[PDB]
DNA sequence: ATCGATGTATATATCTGACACGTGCCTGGAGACTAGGGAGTAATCCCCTTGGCGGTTAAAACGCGGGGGACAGCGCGTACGTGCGTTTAAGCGGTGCTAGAGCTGTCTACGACCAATTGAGCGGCCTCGGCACCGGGATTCTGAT
DNA sequence: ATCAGAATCCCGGTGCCGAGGCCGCTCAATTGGTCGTAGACAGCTCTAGCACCGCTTAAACGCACGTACGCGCTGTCCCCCGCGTTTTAACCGCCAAGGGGATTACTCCCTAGTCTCCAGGCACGTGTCAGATATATACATCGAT
């Protein structure tokens, strides 16, 4: 295997994750496996949310994650939602939810 | 002439997951920065682990406690998981 | 006339406006608004489209998340309607001015 | 109170002077001036086919312009305003 | 070409518009000016930085990375608008 | 072993909040928000702590806890 | 030195070194610790001349935690700037709320 | 017997400026210096982030200047941006 | 309670713009060497944490009675919702101008780097004051009288 | 009002310890001097921001009316508060053990830096299908009747 994404089994491009790094001026030196750590984990994380929200669009019969559908996945989860707190996402809308007075008896 | 991003590698980890949804291209702007987010919080975490330590290099064992300190608990988990997982391969053969 | 009891447009419409994504408040008033307030930080910007829907979608966003604040506060005092003590008691808490 | 060093305020005066562009308020700017006189010079010295004319890049405002002609000749040229007013006050016990 | 008092084009069915959505059955009628007094404290605190981003960048137009960044000062990160 | 934040104490941190009058059922309440609180303080601590490979979570481990969780703490060396 | 060439008190050497080894970038102007040197004494002035005043008030020679929290909550533009920030052996501001006040 | 840094004596030089009879206890020591600390590295911190958001490799003035603009609220961010100025301005007078 | 009809939700047919895909180039990722400095590891010092204890005393815990504040119910008036008709100005498209973003070459100032060196700063040490406090006196609170 | 019983505030002598001042030394800040390059300046290009017009039409406005709900008022009761008494365990000072933090010396291997390929990725361009809407249809449900 050539590239190092190839050869450490993920998606996530280890070489660019590495580039940015570097010039990113988080440090003097960036070890070999922190890259490659580090795109395990961004590709964890999206993984999670991208499956969450294919369920989300399956839910709804359509076929297309728009940003609505990142959304529910996002805030229907309570861990993600803890991480994705302080975030909004363009064109995400709401959770349904109307408060429990609110309805008529 | 160019311009980097993660537009392609977020369907790669799409197609892998969900074999035939697509994803609409406002979503990918979303996802594009939501990776450009996670990336940037877990280096300046690896960062801050490096210089509280009197390190220089941000090794594995930075990333992973940046992982544990930001990400909750079973995302934690998981992710740690995975990226030891890696790394391990990576080393290997 | 034929009416629904009051409560109940009001409950399809939370339904309705909570199911769809659309910005709510209508785009040209909050472009001249958004220059409005710039204007008194550097005469004569110019500003990405993308960036007055940046600016639309983020007040949209604080708004909802503050009125849903508000109503929390409105319902925690055994009203329905929210009122000026209710927002500024919500703003008080989360830390604004 | 520098005795050397001035602001220049154009007086009153009837037939339009064409200085007016250069002015910031109603200070005469050196720095629109000086603008606008490389930017003539260089644009001029690119109409000059068969040699090579080149504009040094900028340095401070006395030597407002240095042209090189071909490459052993070197030009300073330094535009000055003309006054045929009296000297200025403070310039008088000297020469 | 000088701009004055568009806080009113926050008219009063947008903002029951976002309250709606929100969760809010019925708003009072005091509501439209203190949400337009908030809004507008807001989109200073937010357009300041834009501006001050842009200034440094020595830019005369605010982009639309000039405002995430802004919001993602404020503690607001905001999500699909590149960077 | 929470019990040790007793009634009293917690009487006296709503005083000084400015509280008049405390109900009964606010006891119960701020020991389980105040073993939330140092759960994730505590949490992060000893990760710093963890991978210092050290023993002894220290001050700075602390305040540095403390700033992770947005709640900066002037005072300790940092 | 090079904090006297600027009229400081602040250590514009120690800045400079702390946003060279800091890994801020990989360059840092000359002009730029000076700046910050000088805005940091200009914020430290501003608050031990507000705790000074508020111990000076209590009486004291001798500024303790509690007149840092006294100027730095009182003062409008500091709490902004320190709203996120418990001082260690600070108290908080007397403060009844009007209602609890008796009738 | 090593040399740990910190802003004692230098907290103390300003405070015997501006209140020259008024000391300061070893606890409002500590917490002085962490205040030091952390405005610093939130000045640093929004510094760095301008000049990667800008492509630069410099913190310069124009970004410290920047990020005292950003952080410091309005009245405090004017004066501490003139004092910046006038101490650079200074320091640029000198040789 | 049926209508009913308003509204919501379900079903199919059509259009079209957005997306998923097939190329061509290019530039950034990868690989092989070299070198040196950062990190690991072992040894040693000594500080600083933990534990145990005995006593004292301030604080916690407990009982109790009583009053004052929480909570429910009712009434009343206003003020918010809802529906219609009229007015307004957003949204869209289309054009047209151009101000400014963005890329590129050149060149110079500026900052990193290294070696010498010299004073500023840190640490140990010690003397003085400043705060806590005790006590006595005086004024001002809260509450029954 | 009043009178009292504390609570609080003022003023002064007093002790303790901690802060402020001094001195010695080592190490980092300063200063030259050299070199490389970041960035500033200008100049070209063309994208994209602004401005404006005219139509259509959806939304905003204004108004009228009724009724739901906010709010004040009253009544009851339970449940905190405040106080006095008994208990308990926190503070403190002291001492001992020893675990671990912190430092130093040595060595090695891991990463930066550089140069040399070359394929992964991006912009371009294109074909098609997922979704929005139209039209039609089955059924929930709000509600005054």
């Known amino acids: 295997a050539k590239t190092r994404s190839s050869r450490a089994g993920l998606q996530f491009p280890v070489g660019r994750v590495h580039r940015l790094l570097r010039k990113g001026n988080y440090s003097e030196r960036v070890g070999?496996?922190?890259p490659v750590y580090l795109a395990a984990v961004l590709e964890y994380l999206t993984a999670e949310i991208l499956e969450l929200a294919g369920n989300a669009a399956r839910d709804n019969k359509k076929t297309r994650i728009i940003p609505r559908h990142l959304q529910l996945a996002i805030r229907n989860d309570e861990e993600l939602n803890k991480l994705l707190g302080r975030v909004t996402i363009a064109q995400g809308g709401v959770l349904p939810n109307i408060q429990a007075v609110l309805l008529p008896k | 002439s160019r311009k980097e991003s993660y537009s392609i590698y977020v369907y790669?980890?799409?197609?892998?997951?969900?074999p035939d949804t697509g994803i609409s291209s406002k979503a990918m702007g979303i996802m594009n920065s939501f990776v450009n987010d996670i990336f940037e919080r877990i280096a300046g975490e690896a960062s801050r682990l490096a210089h509280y330590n009197k390190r220089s290099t941000i090794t594995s064992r930075e990333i992973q406690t940046a992982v544990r300190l930001l990400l909750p608990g079973e995302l934690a988990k998981h992710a740690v998981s995975e990226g030891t997982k890696a790394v391990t391969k990576y080393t290997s053969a | 006339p034929h009416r629904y009891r009051p409560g109940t447009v009001a409950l399809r419409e939370i339904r309705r406006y909570q199911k769809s994504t659309e910005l709510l408040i209508r785009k040209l008033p909050f472009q001249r608004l958004v220059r409005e307030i710039a204007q008194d930080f550097k005469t004569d910007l110019r500003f990405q489209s993308s960036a007055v829907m940046a600016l639309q979608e983020a007040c949209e966003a604080y708004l909802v998340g503050l009125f849903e604040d508000t109503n929390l506060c409105a319902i925690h005092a055994k009203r329905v309607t929210i009122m000026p003590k209710d927002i500024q008691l919500a703003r008080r808490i989360r830390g604004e001015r | 109170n520098t005795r050397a060093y001035y602001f220049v305020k154009f007086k009153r005066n009837p037939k339009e002077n064409p200085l007016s562009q250069f002015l910031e308020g109603e200070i005469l700017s050196a720095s629109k001036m000086l603008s606008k006189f490389r930017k003539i010079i260089k644009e001029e010295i690119n109409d000059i086919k068969d040699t090579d004319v080149i504009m040094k890049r900028k340095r401070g405002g006395s030597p407002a312009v240095?042209?090189?002609?071909?490459?052993?000749?070197s030009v300073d040229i330094t535009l000055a305003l003309?006054?045929?007013?009296s000297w200025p006050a403070s310039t008088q016990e000297g020469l | 070409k000088v701009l004055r008092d568009n806080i009113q084009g926050i008219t009063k069915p947008a903002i029951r518009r976002l309250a709606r959505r929100g969760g809010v059955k019925r708003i009072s009628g005091l509501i439209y000016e203190e949400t337009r007094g908030v809004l507008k404290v807001f989109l200073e605190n937010v357009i300041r930085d834009a501006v001050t981003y842009t200034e440094?960048?020595?830019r005369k137009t605010v982009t639309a990375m000039d405002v995430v960044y802004a919001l993602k000062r404020q503690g607001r990160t905001l999500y699909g608008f590149g960077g």
């Open chain 1, 32 to 34: 070999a496996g922190a």
């Open chain 2, 12 to 18: 790669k980890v799409l197609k892998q997951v969900h």
């Open chain 4, 66 to 73: 240095t042209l090189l002609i071909s490459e052993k000749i």
């Open chain 4, 82 to 85: 003309e006054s045929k007013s």
């Open chain 5, 56 to 58: 440094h960048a020595k």
